[PDB]
Amino acid sequence: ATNLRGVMAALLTPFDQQQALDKASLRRLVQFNIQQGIDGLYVGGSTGEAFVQSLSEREQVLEIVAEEAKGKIKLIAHVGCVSTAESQQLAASAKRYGFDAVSAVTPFYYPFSFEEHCDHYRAIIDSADGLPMVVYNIPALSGVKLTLDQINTLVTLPGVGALKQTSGDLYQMEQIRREHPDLVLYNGYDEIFASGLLAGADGGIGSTYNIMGWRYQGIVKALKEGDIQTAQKLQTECNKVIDLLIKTGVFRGLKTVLHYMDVVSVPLCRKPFGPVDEKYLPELKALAQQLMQER
Amino acid sequence: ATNLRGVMAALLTPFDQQQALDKASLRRLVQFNIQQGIDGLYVGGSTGEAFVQSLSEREQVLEIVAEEAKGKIKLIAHVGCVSTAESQQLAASAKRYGFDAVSAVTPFYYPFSFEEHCDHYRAIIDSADGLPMVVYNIPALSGVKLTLDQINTLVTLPGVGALKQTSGDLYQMEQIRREHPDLVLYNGYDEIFASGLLAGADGGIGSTYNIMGWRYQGIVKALKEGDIQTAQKLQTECNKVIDLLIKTGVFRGLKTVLHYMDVVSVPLCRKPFGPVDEKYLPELKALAQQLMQER
Amino acid sequence: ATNLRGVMAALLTPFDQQQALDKASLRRLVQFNIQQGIDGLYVGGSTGEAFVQSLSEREQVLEIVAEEAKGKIKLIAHVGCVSTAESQQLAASAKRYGFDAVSAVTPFYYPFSFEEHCDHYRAIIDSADGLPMVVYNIPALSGVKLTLDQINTLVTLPGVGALKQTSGDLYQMEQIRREHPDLVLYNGYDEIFASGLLAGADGGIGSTYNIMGWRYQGIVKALKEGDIQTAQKLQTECNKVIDLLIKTGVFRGLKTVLHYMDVVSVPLCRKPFGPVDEKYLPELKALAQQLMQER
Amino acid sequence: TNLRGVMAALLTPFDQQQALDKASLRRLVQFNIQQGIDGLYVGGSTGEAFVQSLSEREQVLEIVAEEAKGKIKLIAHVGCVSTAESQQLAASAKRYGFDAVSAVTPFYYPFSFEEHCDHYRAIIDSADGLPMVVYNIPALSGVKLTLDQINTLVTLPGVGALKQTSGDLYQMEQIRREHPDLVLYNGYDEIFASGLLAGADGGIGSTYNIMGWRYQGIVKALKEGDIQTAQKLQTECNKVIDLLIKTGVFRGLKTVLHYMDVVSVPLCRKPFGPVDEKYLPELKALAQQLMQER
């Protein structure tokens, strides 16, 4: 659990024209993130298109990322599946590969009781064989709505070392910080990062950090130095980008920017995601050029 | 020979004590359904625990069910995955095994545009090579809320032969029947089956048909003969059972009933589903005895 | 008719060009409903535009409708307001005017505990001085989402004699009938009337009954006689009308049809409701003619 | 001269028979002024307006103006579901000398967005020059507006501000980015510091009645770049809000105000019930702590 606090990018999974893993672009993207100063990578989560990959495909990505980055930056393996046994297989693999921590989204589609969710985390923690667990709360995508008391119980389970909080409820963010002063608490919605840190988060995990992670590190520094205006300006600039990416489709817009930066060979997401509408390419090319000039 | 209208059980997947497929119990369950007069089986859907199975495990179940039932009753293979490519693999297997139709839940977890959903169905229909597609609308589990205009577009795509409507909105059920007089329209919530037929459904697919399918066939017969009192009485009896299964957990309560009926050897669902609370066993054993006396 | 069961129109409130009550048109509408063979009127509910009327305006309508219909058909006074004291004033007026029952929507806007809801009903029942209470459950408009156990507690409060169930959940409709075999249970969504009766409602209250109440009485008779086909055909015709009224705006579309039927002098609703888009007048006039010819 | 600032959403004190307690209303207005509040928002949810008649709401507007006009800013929430009723209140607010009017999106019945716009235009007409504060509170009204709809509302002729009772701080930043000079009040007290950081330039809140100075302290701390002080103050506000949500907010606030010798009888109007007596020790202890701090 060596310090898990920080700004960590939710890594994308590059694919080739036939939708297979593009290993060389994966390695390039890991190195690009390290080069840009990110504190760590969250691998195999929503942003990595894990839910449109098989288990073996997810392991393959975890293995390659560890080869490229173990020892250089922190690595968190998102091993969550609806199935507990599948999540356990991935957690055992993350341990074999040398990750620093594992994480799992609350299992979705079928409704499960809170006790069932707790037992699922406990089983995954057991298979992780010592790697701390990062509980992942993302009600918008999972459809699982936890109460504060439920979140408190999950984060206090033996073996849990952090919470990735993908919720826009900043009253709840403050309540979680108040109940757990030492908890590693990652803000999950990039578009509210500055407000999330002010409410109590102490870092973040996000998809847009792959192209402008230094802006989020800039907001952490600005808030630490009491430079409110610089923090607001950086968040505003991040939000102009996020508005565009929500229009284009976020993962595919990010991959398109990284393709214009010569990091990702083919900017496609796996079906059923479609391609980026060509009407957005002028904006995406201009953003890539701007970000390359900036840093 | 090609009629998909009717009362079709959503098949459960029996597991052994190690959570692996119990083939002998799967075969016994297929035969049990055929013996109760079911019109067909919907295989590999929610009820079959498809979302906690691998693709190979799903194909294994499809293959075994076709060995046991092809030619005896209608067989619909639910081949839907979040991934379009995985769904295409299962659609081609369903055609090789001789299923009568395929079906796919709207892809979930990630938000997809309506056009993305339409292209996902078109791709699966291409891979089903002749087997009609049953569009599957289940907003409560998938999180995908389609408008009536969107449902109308989906059910008119070339190659779509039916709609499994797991919605309790019976105004929408009537509107779909009025716009598509010839559409095979399956009521998906067993607890409103009689009302759903009255609103316009011409059959149903449901999990509880595994243990009392003859009651739903009885409701169809009663409404056809104008016997409202018998239809209401049968629906009331089904709802007394559904109330219990919602308290126990539906799939595991059904597997438990089937275990007492000597069909399923071990009644467990896959983790994260937990076991049935022992406090409910008296009622489940009594229900198994009552249903056996009725059949 | 020594009970409250039946088909009761939710009465509209006609206004003149200045948006003040049009007494002559209100009397014509009450008589028009009686001529259709309606069993009663539900007055001062959503459909009478009560929530854009003052307490004295609501009282005025109650007084006039009792003058016109007391002793001819059943009269239920919806007296509900957010305030308990205001609801009590209208309940006392309804008793003085000779209504057969009072009714109150669950108080809305502010969240109230279930105990507070129960106390609100008890206080209104005290002021109603013997008139039975019709609990009114309409989650879509009120924002109040009651559980089945809470509905069961409300309908068994002392002095409660019926439930107006404006919910499209027909599983809950059947559960309420199963728990309360003798309860007067009105189906609230006109577009699912036939299915609501099949699920357990024993009558209905609806806005569209003002222009075609004989159709809903026809559905009750058809189901009683086991003529499923006629019930379905009548429900389909009602739903073709409801589809139109939802496009035009329901209260104003209904008022416009009644204007073409020579009942309502000026078909306006009160701001913020706007007027009917002129493009819909031909369809509304054609409908009035169709209904007048059908009678 | 502007409407930016920290404004308390005023409570309406009642006597034991649920009628307006005028003397307690006047004491509460002066108590807010003494706390350094910038203005009062009168006749909104917090004032129990939706369980008051039009005449009762006018009466409160009149008394508050008598007590505070010319001392602090006054915003009259005149919204009703009915447009004509809202117009009557707007005309009264102008007669009494309020600085602005405000109206919640009409609720209960679903209205089209054009109908909402026409409702605000009619109220603005009757307000006869007073600026309109659009009030977006989806959790209570049930009206869910898109960002484009909010942009259209805040740019209607005569609109001068938006009370944003939404915890979506991405939308808060988007509104600030689209309208740099808009008066934008944070509506959820428990996220005030984060709301100002996202773009709000003030706030309107029910809890300001008992600790308004803490919210002014957060505004000052952020302006001076003292993040830790802002966070510590928000944390203290949230420990209080956690309690008030357990006790019931309006009645808990009135009970604290009663222990502060401001409100004679702390009841809310039915259907609100009384404060569970198990919570009185905590409420009295809070009143004592606030008076000592203050």
Curated annotation (Swiss-Prot), chains A, B, C:
InterPro entries, per database record: Aldolase_TIM, DapA-like, NanA, Schiff_base-form_aldolases_AS, Schiff_base-form_aldolases_CS
Residue sites binding aldehydo-N-acetyl-D-mannosamine per the record: T166, G188, D190, E191, S207
GO MF assignments: identical protein binding; N-acetylneuraminate lyase activity
Catalytic center residues: Y136 (proton donor), K164 (schiff-base intermediate with substrate)
Pfam families in the record: DHDPS (PF00701)
PANTHER family recorded: N-ACETYLNEURAMINATE LYASE
Name of the protein described by the UniProt record: N-acetylneuraminate lyase
Swiss-Prot record, chain D:
Site location (Required to correctly position the proton donor): S45, Y108
pH-dependence of activity, as noted: Optimum pH is 6.5-7.0.
Variant or mutagenesis effect after changing T165A: 4-fold decrease in catalytic efficiency for the cleavage of Neu5Ac
Binding site for aldehydo-N-acetyl-D-mannosamine: T165, G187, D189, E190, S206
Temperature-dependent activity: Optimum temperature is 80 degrees Celsius.
Keywords: Carbohydrate metabolism, Cytoplasm, Lyase, Schiff base
EC number: 4.1.3.3
Effect of T46 to A/S: Slight increase in catalytic efficiency for the cleavage of Neu5Ac
EC class of the enzyme, as a word: lyase
UniProt xrefs under InterPro entries: Aldolase_TIM, DapA-like, NanA, Schiff_base-form_aldolases_AS, Schiff_base-form_aldolases_CS
Outcome (variant: S45A): 21-fold decrease in catalytic efficiency for the cleavage of Neu5Ac
Function noted in UniProt: Catalyzes the reversible aldol cleavage of N-acetylneuraminic acid (sialic acid; Neu5Ac) to form pyruvate and N-acetylmannosamine (ManNAc) via a Schiff base intermediate. Experiments show the true substrate is aceneuramate (linearized Neu5Ac), which forms spontaneously at alkaline pH. Linear aceneuramate can be provided by NanQ. Can also cleave other substrates such as N-glycollylneuraminic acid (GcNeu), but not colominic acid or 2-oxocarboxylic acids such as 2-oxohexanoic acid, 2-oxo-octanoic acid, 2-oxo-3-deoxyoctanoic acid and 2-oxononanoic acid.
HAMAP family the record matches: N_acetylneuram_lyase
UniProt family annotation: Belongs to the DapA family. NanA subfamily.
Protein name per its UniProtKB record: N-acetylneuraminate lyase
Species assigned in the record: Escherichia coli (strain K12)
